[PDB]
């Protein structure tokens, strides 16, 4: 198979406006949402039916209690970070944690935090250390680096638990996560511009270029979600004889004009 990833994101907001959650947590396998928790629902709920079908009520009951704990911790971390900075008003704290299983069998793992949307702390699980953008971060990193038991816990969690969870979720969601939906590709003329457009494709990684006479200044439309689990994208130009080239999950395609 191809590379896969489990990531969990956390977002907290101090004195958030009405309706807006103080705290959100969402999990992803690759691009697919699997789980959600927030401060308004106070419940860990599946975000994919192959999660809801393969995990009993006690899984959700237990992670509900865990995500209540984490919500409280995040609120406290964020008030501490704000006083260290002498920041008043609404401010942001974000965390991303997860692991990758590559084609080779090899793994990666990562854990970072952002404050008001900027790099703040990045963990190195191999040197069992924390990189800090500034000195307020350094202070927090030092306290965390003083607790060897916790650093070792995280390393173990990234390298062993996270991967174990990734393998279990891939099995549950294999029909979705390991399928291939080749692109439908077509050419439209305009303004005198040619448009190579691709849609109905999964996974989202695709390469698209243009070539005169098989020899290689191009506008790229970003890879956008189509809303049904597939994705779409285009590439455009303004010699004589041109051709659009598309590569996706190890298949090359060519449209001549």
């Amino acid at each position, epitope marked *: 198979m191809r590379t896969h990833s489990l990531r969990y994101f956390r977002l907290g907001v101090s004195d958030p406006i009405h309706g807006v959650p103080e705290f959100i947590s969402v999990g992803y396998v690759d691009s697919h949402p699997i789980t959600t928790y927030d401060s308004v629902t106070r419940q860990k709920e599946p975000r994919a039916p192959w999660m809801a079908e393969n995990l009993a009520p006690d899984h959700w009951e*237990r992670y509900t*209690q*865990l995500l209540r*704990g984490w*919500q409280q*911790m995040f609120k406290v971390e964020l008030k501490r970070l704000q006083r260290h900075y002498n920041h008043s008003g609404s401010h942001t704290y974000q965390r991303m944690i997860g692991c990758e299983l590559l084609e080779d069998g090899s793994t990666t793992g990562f854990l970072q935090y952002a404050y008001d949307g900027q790099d703040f702390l990045i963990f190195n699980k191999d040197t069992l250390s924390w990189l800090a953008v500034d000195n307020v971060a350094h202070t927090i990193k030092q306290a965390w680096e003083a607790n060897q*038991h916790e650093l070792l816990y995280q*390393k*173990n969690w990234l390298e062993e638990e996270c991967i174990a*969870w990734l393998k279990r979720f891939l099995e549950y969601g294999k029909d979705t996560l390991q399928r291939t939906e080749p692109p439908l590709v077509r050419v439209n003329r305009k303004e005198t511009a040619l448009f190579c457009k691709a849609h109905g494709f999964y996974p989202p990684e695709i390469y698209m270029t243009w070539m005169k006479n098989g020899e290689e200044e191009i506008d790229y439309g970003d890879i956008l979600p189509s809303g049904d689990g597939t994705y779409q994208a285009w590439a455009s130009i303004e010699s004589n004889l041109y051709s659009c080239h598309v590569e996706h999950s190890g298949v090359h395609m060519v449209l001549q004009v």
Partner: antibody, heavy 109, light 112 residues
Framework: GQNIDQPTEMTATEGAIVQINCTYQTSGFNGLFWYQQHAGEAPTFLSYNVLDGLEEKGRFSSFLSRSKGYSYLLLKELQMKDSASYLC??????????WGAGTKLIIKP | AGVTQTPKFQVLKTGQSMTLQCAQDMNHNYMYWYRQDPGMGLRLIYYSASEGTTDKGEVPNGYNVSRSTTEDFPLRLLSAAPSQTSVYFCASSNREYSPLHFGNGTRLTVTE
């Protein structure tokens, strides 16, 4: 995380060495703890091991083998005050704390 | 500092009501109630991941808890039964994976 074994009772001599073993079986692990509980007293934390290896702190040492599902607590130069129950516990993938029944250590004067 | 559990000893008539106190000044998010019975070891009654929530352990039946504050986690016996004769340990931990700090226990006997 399901099972955990440690012996009911051990007896060693003042001045000598004692090794309290703990075997565990589980699919999912966030570390193994040893606690000390004196008669009529509260347990207190001794050790946390999560990777393969050995940790020491004064006369006490804690070892973990991940592949064998195996820890020991090693007590050196036994004093009479080391007479206590020793509780081995482990966290599963959901952070459930699984407690062994405890090992009562008797120090022979 | 530490965990303060009260009372240390308690006798009850069958059907009487009882609340055990437990306080910690260490800003710990997690608090726990265990009973300890010969041979079994430590049996979780209830735990609380933070103020505002609580959840059952393995033996919640006959017991109730509140987590109104970070500091306090009372354990309630609604209707004392002989089978609740035990030693109760309250505990706190900073995180779900961090070490437990125990209160000094409650020796509780329920008699007819």
């Amino acid at each position: 995380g399901q099972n955990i074994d440690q012996p009911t009772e051990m007896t060693a001599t003042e001045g000598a060495i004692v090794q309290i073993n703990c075997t565990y079986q589980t699919s999912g692990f966030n570390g193994l703890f040893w606690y000390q509980q004196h008669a009529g007293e509260a347990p207190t934390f001794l050790s946390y091991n999560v990777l393969d290896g050995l940790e020491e702190k004064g006369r006490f040492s804690s070892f973990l083998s991940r592949s064998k599902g195996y820890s020991y607590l090693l007590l050196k130069e036994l004093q009479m005050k080391d007479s206590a129950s020793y509780l081995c516990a482990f966290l599963d993938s959901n952070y459930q704390l699984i407690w062994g029944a405890g090992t009562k250590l008797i120090i022979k004067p | 500092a530490g965990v303060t559990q009260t009372p240390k000893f308690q006798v009850l008539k069958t059907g009487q009501s009882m609340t055990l106190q437990c306080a910690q000044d260490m800003n710990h998010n997690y608090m726990y109630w265990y009973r300890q019975d010969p041979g079994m070891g430590l049996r979780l009654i209830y735990y609380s991941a933070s103020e505002g929530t609580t959840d059952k352990g393995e033996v919640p039946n006959g017991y109730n808890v509140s987590r109104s504050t970070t500091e306090d986690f009372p354990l309630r016996l609604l209707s004392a039964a002989p089978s609740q004769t035990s030693v109760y340990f309250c505990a706190s931990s900073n995180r779900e994976y961090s070490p437990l700090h125990f209160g000094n226990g409650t020796r509780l006997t329920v008699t007819e």
